[model samples]
Target: SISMTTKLSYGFGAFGKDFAIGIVYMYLMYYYTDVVGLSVGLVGTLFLVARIWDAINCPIMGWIVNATRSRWGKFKPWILIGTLTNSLVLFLLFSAHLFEGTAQVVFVCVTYILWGMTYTIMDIPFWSLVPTITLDKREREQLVPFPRFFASLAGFVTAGITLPFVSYVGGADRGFGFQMFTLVLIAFFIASTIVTLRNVHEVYSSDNGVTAGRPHLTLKTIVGLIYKNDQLSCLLGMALAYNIASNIINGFAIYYFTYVIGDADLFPYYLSYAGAANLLTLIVFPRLVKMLSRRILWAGASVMPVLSCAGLFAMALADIHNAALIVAAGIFLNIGTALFWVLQVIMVADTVDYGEFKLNIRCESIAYSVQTMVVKGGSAFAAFFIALVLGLIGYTPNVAQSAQTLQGMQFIMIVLPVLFFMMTLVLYFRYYRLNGDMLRKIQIHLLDKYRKT
Candidate 1:
């Protein structure tokens, strides 16, 4: 079992990563379009292309991670490497105002791509470390929640306080405010990763096992490995669909508040209110899982979000400017989504074991690279959709948009998520079949086959 110090340190690593990533996820498009005066179409195109580029990069990083052997361990070195490089790139990405016109665009393009590449280097192994941390299935499930909880906390802090920080520090210059904010987050990210590196250690399996060491991988072989792990594929599908929906809501939320609600200042309050609910769910969910089956909890979570999404749409249509009702909708929506976020990593870890059992290989990093890809892929598509839709709908930044544009924005922000949620509920229930009994059996067979040696 991992020590308390290790778990806290591990959780802190997520705090650092999500702090940086969440800021980018929530604010990057707005910053480019509103503050930097970039065209929405150009920003959208850049966002999509950068994510596609990074998705391609994920597998290569995974192959490199699995192939690595060092005294410091396979994961930590890459964590360190990714942290240093990504920090510098993040600073540059936020500081694009140092250039002008096309130079600024070029700066954004290069730095965004670099950011994705370096983040993948760190992300794959960070999650891959879970199975390596403990062979006990129950212990691993317990371990999965900490990092997600801290990650959510970091996300909440960013959501709640970022605008205020930007306003206070930026004063007359939003670009300068963002640059300073990125610097602070970068420093925190570096320090947190170092703590994780120092405290968390990987426990290597016995050399005699079927899954003793890194398996030889080619593109064909990796494809075969994923195919063999059926659970992984299903989880990926569910996660990708959910992420797209969640990202749509998040990516356009600023615009929704700025335009629909007619109170740009209300955006952070909505985030904070929802974030508190999300944090509450994260805290309470593990205990709920112990009481309820995964299937039941998931079904409940799925249904709640669909209802909440409908409520939000109605609230928007009613043009009711009631802050309290809006906050109530935000609370329900976040609580619903938070359960999925908490469970996703744990479910993915289960697939790693299933993959090892079926394929006679332990390619944790490679498997998790796909998870990383799904997440990035979802975010990329969402960003592309948001930017593209904004341009098509004639959205004008920092101005009262026309009724036609507001209607279009509402459709994408509120209506789009409902469609995705319905699809996700259907897909998850239809295809994802892993349950407690099956998981227990897989653990038993795995322990018997590999642990015996």
Candidate 2:
């Protein structure tokens, strides 16, 4: 059984990770386009390029982690090392004012690449630990939701407070504002990592007689392992579609409010409303999984987002600017997505068992590393798309937009997301099959296999 200290520490670690990334995920685009005077298209390209590099880096970090051996543990030391380097790079990522002209863009690209690399170093191991924490299916189900819940909470808090804080801190200078706020996030991130590394203990070890010490990973080996796990491939596809849809809603919501909705100041209120829905959904996720079958939960939760997207699309078509309607739709949308975010981790944990059962190998880090890769890839492609769409629509920050531009923004932000949401619902309902007796049989078979070993 996992201790309360470990659970809370692990949860807090997620809060810090998301808090740091949330700042960039939500605000960095706006900062670059408006505050740093970069073109939206350029910033989007940079996100794509940097994230591709980040995606490749995740598996390599996983390979390094599976091979690591130490008295302190494989995951914790990298957690500490990654946190320090990541925090430093995070601070540098926001400190764009430290340079000028072409030099500033160069600085942004370098620091952003370093930021993603450092984050992966810690991120792969952090989620990889979930499988190592316990082999009990139910316990593992319960284990991951804490961190996922805290992560949602962290994203909510960042969305609600970042703009207001940036305004207050920077006063007349928002660039300086982002820098100061980043320093606070970095400090918090470091402290949370310390708590986690100090408290959380691994239940298994690298030298244990599970298989052999980490096999020499190669392109062929990595590709073969993932190719053998069909469920992981399906999950990866769903994650890609889901993240792209979700990021479009999140990454560009500010722009939609500022330019299309004409109420930039109201963005936080909407975020708060949606965030409350997310928090409540996450709180009930553990219970919901118990009450419903995983397949039913996945399909049912998916319908809400699609429906919510329809509502947003209808509102857009009708030229309705009612903030109340928008908030209500957003709340439902976030609630549906909250279930996806939390449960996806649990589902991925199940696939690790599936891999071991079918292939007699447990490569948790590598599995989760691929999960991380798809997530970043999805977000990267979404960011690039958003930037491209905004540029194509003639979106200029801090200026009065034409009716044509507003219409284009509404179409991409609303109609495009609706289609993406629909695609995700289709993927999950059609391809994913890990539920009911099949899942239980896999678990029972694996337990028996472990005992025999």
Candidate 3:
């Protein structure tokens, strides 16, 4: 038994790696717009462009990573390299010197592109380790939940974790907020790397099945793989659909919290409360998965966000000022989203088995790389659309605006998100078939393909 796997599985340090990077991705736009006082539309365009670059580089990196062979394993070197480089990149991104207009734009474009490309080098290989590291599907199923649960808490923690310390450091002036935030990321990145170095082991050879697997892989390989495997193709389709819809809904959340709720300070608190609420769910998730099919849980999880968006839209339309209703709605929406996130990952892991059966290879990284591209593409598109919406409405930060502008903010919050969440529900619900029985058969066939070795 490799103790390292278990440690890696439970490691908050791993979560912290994500937590550090996420602070930039999730909050950078809001930070740029709300704190740094840039226009949302401009920053959103920058965010969109970065993802475009990320999409192009991501799979190419994945293919290259899979082609590598070394003493450190195909993936482990990246764990070290990405940690150091991404840490430096993150710190520079938040440096106060980039505060001006063109300089700020240049800073964002450069750092984000660097960060996105390098970070995926780490992530693509890291996910590929899952299939190579473990053979037992049930064990794989059992192992996936812990990392994700911690990963969620890490997001929740990062979402609000900095708030308590921001005041302690000298607020925005003296660059204290940025300085303190960077230090936190640096600390977490270091800690995560150390833990990973000491723990996490990769067992499979980069050359295992390499020759036979080589011919089937290409930029266009995913197409043939899809045609051969219905279940694998279905999973990818569902992922794209979900990512597009979810991104559309979440793209509007910050706007909804700040504008619709009318209290920017409470946003972190709202997220923390939602995270806390999911603790009970995370504790129950493994058992919950066994109790119900993934399809059913996915359906149940999708319902709340859909309805929560509807409620938020209704409340905004009514022009009610009651903070309680707004906060309640936000909390409910996150609760639903959290469930969707965990279950969706479990669903993603199942596709590995499907691919192996049809293609006679485990393309976890390739599959996940494509999955990530779709997710990032959807997110970038949604953010850009949100920006355009705000620009159309004359939405400006920290400045007085016309009543019409304020009303437009309300539309972005309620109407836009609600519409997308409805689409999300439809997409997830239609993602039928490919449960436990289907995967087991796929696994058995796939293993036989490699059995001669």
Candidate 4:
């Protein structure tokens, strides 16, 4: 048995880890354009470039991580190093306002890229543990939800309080407030990772499959592994599709709440409730797993966001502004995303086994790196669209909008998400193949691959 202490510590690592990024995912775009005095076009370019570069950077880091053989183990050493460096960069990323003109712009650019690369260092190793730790499906179901639960917990705690926290810490200086706010998160981030590093470790040799399966991963070897593993591609597709949908929805939160509904507090209120709902879903998830098929679970989870969107659309059309009702709906609307987050860790872990089953090579680090790539790709694309559309439709900050402008913003906030959700639903049913039947073969195959005398 993996002791409760170890599992809880491991889960806290995700809490610490996700804590570092909550702001970057939901508020970074707005911060750059509105808070930092960067133009929309420039901010968009930065996200597109940095995230795309990080997307490409993810797989390379994964390959390198898989190749590692060391005393602290492949994953933990990198996790420590990644945490220290990434936490520093996160501070600098938010401290951009310290510089003026050219210096400020240059600083932000360097720090943002550093932030992406450093994050990948720990992120890949952190997740590689899922497959490295255990092979039992039931055990995994129990383990996976904790990390996601804490991730949602950490993520929403910061996200929901972001504005309030900034106000409390930095007061009227929005720039200083954000910088200080980032510092608090990084403190949590560093502490959590160290706990994981101290308490959590590989059950199998950290380099178990890597050393024997294929010691040196050449470019051709990597390509072949990526190409031959169809599940990896399916995971990639499903992740990017949903992230693009969800990130767009997230990026619009400021506009929807601050301007459209005319209350900034409501944004946090809604997130608090939605986050509560999402957490409850994780708490209740394993029971549901026993009761539902993968197909049924996936469909049910996918519907959560779509229903939320429909609620928003109806509210937008009706001009409803009851804070009680709006935030209350957060309970029903937000579960799917959190459930999907749990599924991602589980699915990616399974895909590692699927890779070994299909291609006779196990690439856990590289496989798990798809998690980071899809996140960056989704955030980049979503920010890109938000930037372009806002600029195109004559949108401005802190002002009343024309009728058409308001209508366009509502369409973007409400309608586009559902379209992408449909894509996710279709893609999951058709392209993803590792259900109960396939996983049975994968598990048997991997037991032989990793568990031996």
Question: Model 3, which residues run further than 4 Å from truth?
Answer: 1-10, 30-41, 96-105, 135-138, 170-177, 202-216, 222-233, 260-269, 317-324, 384-432, 448-450
- What local distance difference test score does each model get? 0.78, 0.78, 0.64, 0.80
**What digit string (tens of lDDT, one per residue) describes model 3 on residues 1-453?**
435455464455558667777677666765666666777777766777878888777777667765666667666776678777878887777773446777776776687778777677666665555555555555555555566667776777776766556556776553457657788878876786677655666543334643124423576664455546665556555555556556766656654565666675666666666777676566576677778866667776766766766776777677555566666766676666666767655555566556665555565666667666766777766666666877777773637887767766766655665555556556555654556677677656655655444
Pull out the clashing pairs in model 2: none
**Span of 10 residues, lowest total lDDT, candidate 1:** 204-213
* RMSD of candidate 2 to true structure, Å: 3.4
Q: Give the per-residue lDDT of model 4 (tens digit) for 111-142.
A: 99999899999999998888877866767778
List of clashing residue pairs for candidate 1? none
Candidate 4: lDDT over CA atoms?
Answer: 0.80
Candidate 1 per-residue C-alpha lDDT over 206-321 given as tens digits, one digit per residue, 9 for 90 to 100:
12235545545576677567767787888878877788888887655555576577465676677788878887777777678878877777776666766777777777777656
Q: For every model shown, what is its TM-score relative to the native structure?
A: 0.88, 0.88, 0.83, 0.89
Please list all clashing residue pairs in model 4, or write none if there are none: none
Question: Model 2, stretches more than 4 Å misplaced?
Answer: 167-173, 204-207, 211-213, 262-265, 383-416, 451-453
Q: How many pairs in model 1 have backbone atoms within 3 A of each other, for residues 3 or more apart or on separate chains, i.e. clashes?
A: 0
Best by lDDT: 4
Better of 1 and 3 by TM-score: 1
